[PDB]
Design a protein around this nucleic acid. Structure first.
Lengths: 72, 85, 106, 43, 247, 61
RNA sequence: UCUGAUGGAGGAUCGAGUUGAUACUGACGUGCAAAUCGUUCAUUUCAAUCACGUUUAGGGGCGAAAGACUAAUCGAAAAG
RNA sequence: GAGAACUUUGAAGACUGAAGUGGAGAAGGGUUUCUUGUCAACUGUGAUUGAACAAGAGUUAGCCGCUCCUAAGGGAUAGCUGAAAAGUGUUUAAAGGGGUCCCCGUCUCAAAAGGGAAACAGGUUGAUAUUCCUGUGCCAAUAGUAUUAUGAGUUAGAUGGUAACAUAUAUAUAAAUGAACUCCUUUACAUAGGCUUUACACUCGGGGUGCGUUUUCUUUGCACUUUACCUUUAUAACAAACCUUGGAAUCAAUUUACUUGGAGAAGAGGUUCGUUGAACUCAAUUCAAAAAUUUGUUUUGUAGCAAUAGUAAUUCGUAAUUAUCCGAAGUGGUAAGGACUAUCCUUGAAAAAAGGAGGGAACGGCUUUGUGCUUUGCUACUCUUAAUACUUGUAUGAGCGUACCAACAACCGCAUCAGGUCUCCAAGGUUAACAGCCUCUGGUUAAAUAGAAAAAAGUAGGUAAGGGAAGUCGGCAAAAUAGAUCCGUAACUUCGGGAAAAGGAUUGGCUCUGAGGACAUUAAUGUUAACUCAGAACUGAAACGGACAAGGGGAAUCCGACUGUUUAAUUAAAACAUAGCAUUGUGAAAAGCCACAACUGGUAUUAACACAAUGUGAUUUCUGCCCAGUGCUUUG
RNA sequence: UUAUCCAUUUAUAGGGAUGAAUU
């Protein structure tokens, strides 16, 4: 498992052919924070989003033919 | 304070073995555990490593010597005769 | 308290079978075998540990990156820096004395 | 023991197989029987 | 009777040398043209302890002449030699402690070790710690020279035989009293199975000629002839004399 | 056990008729020396660092 | 020379465990047991203890020595 | 159930008491394992039980092991002996590999505790789990050509730092030319002692949740409150070592201890390794101050794994919802690491495998002349990772073990035998303590029998007035204190001891008093921890190491100096050994001692401070006379 | 010295005047 913080690196990894699935995790903190995890052949890359607006925008902009799995 | 009147380092032997044997072993353990002058670095830090090997803690250099002392009179005499020429 | 047991077919506490207890997320205390600690690489002359180079066991050293196995100067990763400098001056000065003896022969 | 050789394991299986009783239908027309605790097969 | 303990030693079953941790045989360089007509200098890279013996050994590095490379030699160290020292070997090597010279080249009265009783056997005499031989004379024609061995015997050896100038280190090892049986146990643990001894007079007559009786005595003269068979040579073998010495 | 520990904190069950190990076994004298030396050395280092004492007096003490 | 600390040596001491086996000449002695049980006792940094592997084979081995041990067999094993 | 003291369930009373009939393994066993039946015999009483009998079933691995390496060593080859059988194993070996003529080179086996490519958590079955499922990783391998793509380098091999050294973060730190030939390092190593760090363990307090006590008291007692491998995990911190600057006696730095310095200390600033593995604002983000990207201030996240899993709860058809999973500390038990010090007439394996270096052999591409080279005309090319396509024989992951017992009835003792049998984990109280005794988790309440009665006698214990060894071969057996603190301690002595000599006093509970540390502010004030000593009152049937645990001393004599060893199953000793002492042989491959039928071999990887053969048996003080006898030995 | 025997080695130069060093 690898955590990545750069949004451009995240999208660049997502667009790659190896990537198959994106995992969406949402949970209440104290506000709901989320974690987006691309599943590649080598590693599983997660980025943590504190806000909801940016997380939704990234999820929508995410390439759609790769399958989505929501854990909650 | 002074811990032993005369037994010295042989106090580790307690009362075992003869007094003469303990005194004789004391006489040479005294010089077996002593520090000797390292003629290469000039610091008195040469200690016995094994039965005939003496290592300088500073030089890290080791030298063949006597069983219980860095030098033996028989060896120093021979070296003196050789260097005379 | 929770008691543990060996898991790696070796049930004697030899130096290759040292273990570390660890508490799992399942709330149970288990045992993991610790890797044997490797000695540090040493200089060829002074037999002193050379810095800038990792101290991995051969299996790990095979997988380590090249940057982590060497230094970058002369006998790097084989001779310590002070020994190398002493060898430098020894070579140069001894060639110099040889040359001056050759020129003083006549 | 738990760790065994292949030949030893096959021998154990054969010795277990030979411990079954005579079939009933055959009895319409055994003595070489052993118990694991009484007679050790030594092999 | 049965085979006695001395007889069982030659079978070499449990009486072989405990040699697991020995560092190698102590030998000088094999004779070479360099050693015959010049000096070759080797650097004593290290001096180590050989668990069998009392004298320390010297790991000496020579540079091969027939091919590129370095050769390693294990030479019984002389008293006073140190790591990082260059020792010269051969006919033309200067006479100094640690050098290897032919016996014919050293003057009379010098002390030597690592002697070759026959030229080229790379070292056979004077090797136990603290021992030395004295060169007590050379022949007029060269070719022969007389030495006095640590046993006090004069021996005549050809002049080309080599030896090391100096005395072998770790001298005086005898003067320390082994205080306790444990030190003797550890001493012989790395040499042989010659210890403890057990007196033959305490055995039974079946396994020793000294054994038996109601009083633990020899019963017959303890000096045995040189021609006595293997199970019979048990006492003082071919003794020229007995009792305390007076000179 | 909590109540007994509280009583011990008040010093209730430490009498000489309640001790079974020797004095050193109960309170290691080497450890007592260790603590005392460490506090004295810490104090001396603090004084030298704060310059309330000089280097020579620090070494002497 | 004397005093107080520090230090941690020793085939040092007590002592569980381990390894043994002093005494009761206890029990048992058609035993739980072809050598056990109970109490007592010796031993614990070393000539220490244990395991596996390996070597030595019978007029031979091995023995800190008791004619000990060498598969319940030893002043010459066991099998034919 | 026909039948129940010994089958099952519930309740109770108890035990085992983390040195366990608790969990894992090895040797050995071999199906005893599981389920369903079942009782002829066995399960020394019963028996419906069972390790019995019967029928079925059950053991899943690239990561756990073997397999590989080498050790003590075994077998074999060449020889050489021998009738052979066999004995030895390089003693006249032309004995596999490498590059490309030369270099190196007997083979093979021997470790399920040594060395060693790589795995974790949760869940799952009647029986298997680091093996299955889910998820997340890691290791090794991956041929040739051609395409792409990723990075470098170049108009033939990169760059920073004074230095210690550092730098490739591409999905992925993959590439930083390098032959022959070399030289190193890792693998790779003893013991003792303390100091220190971390993890785990234990414990204290707070918050939440559930349960329990509740005649009375109790802001209460108990349980849960978790977080793996992997990410060079990033960083932080620390012991060390090194670099730069610095230039030391009024010597200084510094440890528990000693260690260190003009061969360069302190101070100041750095580098690296190693410990650990989210520490530290660590990361990202908000807000202010530096410029054609730096420093201070917030939020978020158990750093990713990760909560989706576990755990403890509250509800809902019967599979789902919900809430918690966070604020601080102390003790030092175990394990590992670190830096050290000390000991040795003891110096405490090897190889497979891997790495570093020294050295500098070879050199673009397209086309062309002439016999790989000189040549003319042009330049955007070489390495490295990944993917795809085709060719290549089918272009990932072999085989074997995996159930169960491990003794209490699965092993060995003829047996379901009070015996024996190797390793790891190791809670609380009291305490020096892994002792003893009691307890929590786990396990058990079973032992070739039960009930009743309870005399003799036996056996294992208790207690006994007065006397106190009169008993007896003999104080055999038992009794006597025995912990800790304070005091006191003789003869003798090898000066080390004797010594816990001998011999006294005290000890509970309660209420107090005193001493012993750490952390910040402008010389003075606050916050906070450990149990450890000392002293005083009071108190009680004068008792308090209350149980448990736990020396009897002294005066002498004999023997052996001591520690140690011994007749397995009648003798543990004064016997053996021992250090010390003395004697003897031997200068070597034509030697000493010993083995062998021969060949050959052990000591010997040895060399007189050695090897071999003897006697005596620490120390102290001694060791007298006899060479006629018998031995041994020397000359001719 | 040729039989025979022994020793050493990688059978590695014919006799007289503490850097490496190989193509």
């Amino acid at each position: 498992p690898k955590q990545i913080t750069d949004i451009r690196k995240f999208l660049k990894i997502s667009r790659k052919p190896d990537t198959t699935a994106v995992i969406i995790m949402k949970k209440k903190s104290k506000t709901v924070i989320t974690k987006l995890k691309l599943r590649t052949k080598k590693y599983l890359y997660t980025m943590v989003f504190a806000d909801r607006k940016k997380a939704e925008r990234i999820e929508n902009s995410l390439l759609p033919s790769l399958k989505r799995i929501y854990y909650p | 304070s002074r811990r032993t009147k005369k037994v010295g380092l042989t106090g580790k032997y307690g009362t075992r073995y003869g007094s003469s044997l303990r005194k004789q072993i004391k006489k040479i353990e005294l010089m077996q555990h002593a520090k000797y002058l390292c003629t290469f670095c000039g610091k008195t830090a040469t200690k016995r490593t094994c039965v005939g090997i003496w290592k300088c803690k500073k030089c890290k250099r080791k030298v063949c010597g006597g069983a219980w002392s860095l030098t033996t009179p028989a060896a120093v005499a021979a070296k003196s005769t050789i260097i005379r020429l | 308290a929770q008691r543990v047991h060996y898991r790696r077919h070796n049930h004697y506490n030899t130096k290759s079978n040292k273990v570390r207890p660890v508490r799992t997320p399942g709330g149970k205390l288990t045992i993991h075998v610790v890797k044997k600690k490797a000695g540090k690489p040493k200089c060829a002359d002074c037999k002193t540990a050379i810095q800038g180079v990792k101290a991995l066991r051969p299996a790990d050293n095979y997988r380590a990156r090249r940057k982590n196995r060497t230094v970058a100067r002369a006998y790097g990763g084989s001779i310590c820096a002070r020994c190398i400098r002493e060898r430098i001056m020894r070579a140069f000065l001894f060639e110099e004395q040889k040359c001056v003896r050759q020129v003083l022969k006549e | 023991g738990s760790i065994k050789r292949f030949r030893l394991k096959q021998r154990l299986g054969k010795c277990r197989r030979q411990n079954r009783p005579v079939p009933h239908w055959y009895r319409l027309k055994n003595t070489k029987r052993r118990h694991w605790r009484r007679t050790k097969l030594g092999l | 009777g049965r085979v006695i303990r001395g007889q069982r030693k030659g079978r070499g079953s449990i009486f072989k040398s405990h040699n697991h941790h020995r560092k190698g045989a102590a030998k000088l360089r094999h004779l070479d043209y360099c050693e015959k007509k010049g000096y070759i200098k080797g650097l004593v890279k290290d001096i180590i302890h050989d668990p069998g013996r009392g004298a320390p050994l010297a790991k000496v590095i020579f540079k091969r002449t027939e091919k590129y490379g370095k050769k390693e030699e294990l030479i019984i160290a002389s008293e006073g030699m140190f790591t990082g020292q260059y020792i010269s070997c051969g006919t033309k090597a200067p006479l100094s402690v640690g050098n290897i010279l032919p016996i014919g080249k050293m003057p009379e009265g010098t002390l030597i070790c690592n002697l070759e009783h026959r030229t080229g056997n790379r070292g056979t005499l004077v090797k136990a710690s603290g021992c030395y031989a004295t060169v007590v004379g050379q022949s007029e024609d060269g070719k022969k020279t007389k030495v006095r061995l640590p046993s006090g015997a004069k021996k005549t050896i050809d002049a080309k035989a080599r030896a090391m100038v100096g005395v072998v280190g770790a001298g005086g090892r005898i003067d320390k009293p082994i205080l306790k049986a444990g030190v003797a146990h550890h001493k012989y643990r790395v040499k042989r199975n010659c210890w403890p001894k057990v007196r033959g007079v305490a055995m039974n007559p079946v396994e020793h000629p000294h054994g038996g009786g109601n009083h633990q005595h020899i019963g017959h003269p303890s000096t045995v002839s040189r021609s006595a068979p293997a199970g019979q040579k048990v006492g003082l073998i071919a003794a020229r004399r007995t009792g305390l010495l007076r000179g | 056990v909590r109540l007994y520990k509280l009583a011990k904190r008040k010093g209730r069950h430490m009498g000489i008729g309640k001790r079974k190990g020797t004095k050193n076994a109960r309170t290691n004298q080497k450890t007592l020396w260790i603590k005392r030396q460490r506090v004295l050395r810490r104090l001396l280092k603090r004084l030298r660092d704060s310059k309330k004492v000089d280097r020579h007096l620090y070494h002497s003490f």
